[PDB]
Amino acid sequence: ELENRALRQELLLKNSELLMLGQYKQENARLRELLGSPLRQDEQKMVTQVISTVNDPYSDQVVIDKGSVNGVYEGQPVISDKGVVGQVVAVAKLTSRVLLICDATHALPIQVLRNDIRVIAAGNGCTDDLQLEHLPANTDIRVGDVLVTSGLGGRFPEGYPVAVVSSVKLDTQRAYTVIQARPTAGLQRLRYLLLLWGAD
Amino acid sequence: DQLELENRALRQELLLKNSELLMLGQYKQENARLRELLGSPLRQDEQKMVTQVISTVNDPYSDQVVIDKGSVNGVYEGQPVISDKGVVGQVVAVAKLTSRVLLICDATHALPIQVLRNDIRVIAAGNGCTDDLQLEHLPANTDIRVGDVLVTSGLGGRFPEGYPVAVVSSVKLDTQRAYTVIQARPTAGLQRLRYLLLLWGADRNGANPMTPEEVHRVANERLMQM
Ligand SMILES: [Cl-]
Ligand SMILES: [Cl-]
Numbered sequence A: 001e002l003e004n005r006a007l008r009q010e011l012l013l014k015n016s017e018l019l020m021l022g023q024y025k026q027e028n029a030r031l032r033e034l035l036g037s038p039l040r041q042d043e044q045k046m047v048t049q050v051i052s053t054v055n056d057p058y059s060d061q062v063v064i065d066k067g068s069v070n071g072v073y074e075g076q077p078v079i080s081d082k083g084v085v086g087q088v089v090a091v092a093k094l095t096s097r098v099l100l101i102c103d104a105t106h107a108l109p110i111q112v113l114r115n116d117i118r119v120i121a122a123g124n125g126c127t128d129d130l131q132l133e134h135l136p137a138n139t140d141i142r143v144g145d146v147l148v149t150s151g152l153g154g155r156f157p158e159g160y161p162v163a164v165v166s167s168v169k170l171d172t173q174r175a176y177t178v179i180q181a182r183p184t185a186g187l188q189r190l191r192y193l194l195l196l197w198g199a200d
Numbered sequence B: 001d002q003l004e005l006e007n008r009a010l011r012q013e014l015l016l017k018n019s020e021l022l023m024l025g026q027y028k029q030e031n032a033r034l035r036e037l038l039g040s041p042l043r044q045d046e047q048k049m050v051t052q053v054i055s056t057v058n059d060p061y062s063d064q065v066v067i068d069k070g071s072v073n074g075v076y077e078g079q080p081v082i083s084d085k086g087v088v089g090q091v092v093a094v095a096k097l098t099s100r101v102l103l104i105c106d107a108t109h110a111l112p113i114q115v116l117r118n119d120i121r122v123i124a125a126g127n128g129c130t131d132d133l134q135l136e137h138l139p140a141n142t143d144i145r146v147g148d149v150l151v152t153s154g155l156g157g158r159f160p161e162g163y164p165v166a167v168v169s170s171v172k173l174d175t176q177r178a179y180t181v182i183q184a185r186p187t188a189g190l191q192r193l194r195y196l197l198l199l200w201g202a203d204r205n206g207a208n209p210m211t212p213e214e215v216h217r218v219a220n221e222r223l224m225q226m
Helices: A002-013 A015-034 B002-021 B024-038 B212-224
Strands: A044-053 A061-064 A077-079 A084-091 A096-100 A107-112 A118-122 A130-132 A146-149 A161-171 A176-183 A192-197 B047-056 B064-067 B080-082 B087-094 B099-103 B110-115 B121-125 B133-135 B149-152 B164-174 B179-186 B195-200
Touching: A002 A015, A002 B002, A015 B002, A015 B024, A044 B002, A061 A084, A107 A161, A130 A161, A146 B024, A192 B002, B024 B195, B064 B087, B110 B164, B110 B212, B149 B212
Parallel strands: none
Antiparallel strands: A044 A061, A044 A192, A061 A096, A077 A084, A077 A192, A084 A096, A107 A118, A107 A146, A118 A130, A130 A176, A146 A161, A161 A176, B047 B064, B047 B195, B064 B099, B080 B087, B080 B195, B087 B099, B110 B121, B110 B149, B121 B133, B133 B179, B149 B164, B164 B179
């Protein structure tokens, strides 16, 4: 079982990153004090496993092994190690269905890490990248830009990675920029996910 | 068969730690923005409260934003909003938990300012947020110069005195109409707003409006801690 130590060393490698995170979180708390703002509070998190995909050919959903008896709620965010995966759309008592962010009925408010541009990112089917709202011609948004949740829908906590801009194209005829972004989370062959609750 | 059981615990541990590290990029930028706002040159008797723009009012005819503070937080109509670099605008409509803010580059926004160099006082009006501010037409014999720094005069009873507003960007004599046309570039960024400070001024209950000299000295004091 080489997998035991492969996991152990990947965990060891996270330490310098985790220490750096600690410093950022402490500084953030100091800054929010000085500016009279309430401190950030950690989310509560719960590991969940994908049982199956919904074999609906027109919707991209998976079933997870947690439900109302575990406190799952409609609209609750779901993430993986690499980023946002989706949200809970239907809760049974032991299981729940999660709509994936690349589903065409899924839309998420996001922000560009680099320069704070805010825009909705909508799914277009999990065969394609996410589609941002059309932006003005002179918008400074770049392939490679990291898109994180803005929280402005009151649904997702602000700051989790969603996607990396993959395409920025000017439509000279119609005078706007067309932007697509590729999710950072793997959205195929899912196993373990995290449900998040904001603190109360 | 605890060996496999241990590796599921390890993978779960790794999932949780990775989910923590996902926040790193956000904290880097967030701490940066908050540290900038901390540079705001406030006076001792002045209170501040950070607030977040939670959207821009979709209107091609008005440059307004919505912020995440309201009457519950002590926000009042006509209250200034600032960045560390300049006046951003003022609260025009207060709800319970949110408020609407008029940016100083909106055509319906004007505020009285004072030239730092020589104490000249004049109204600076917005001309739409694609353009610089417009000073009101002045006599041809006005010594205002490109590069002059404009700060709040407080003459409207709205804005604490001596805070940066703009830098004069164009001075042009229209010899036919016989006045000086002057534009000024706001010193605060007015695009892609995120964090701002709501500002409460010090109480001056019966006090007379500040003299040009007092405003100049307050302005220089603010600029010394920048
Ligand atoms: Cl949201
Ligand atoms: Cl005023």
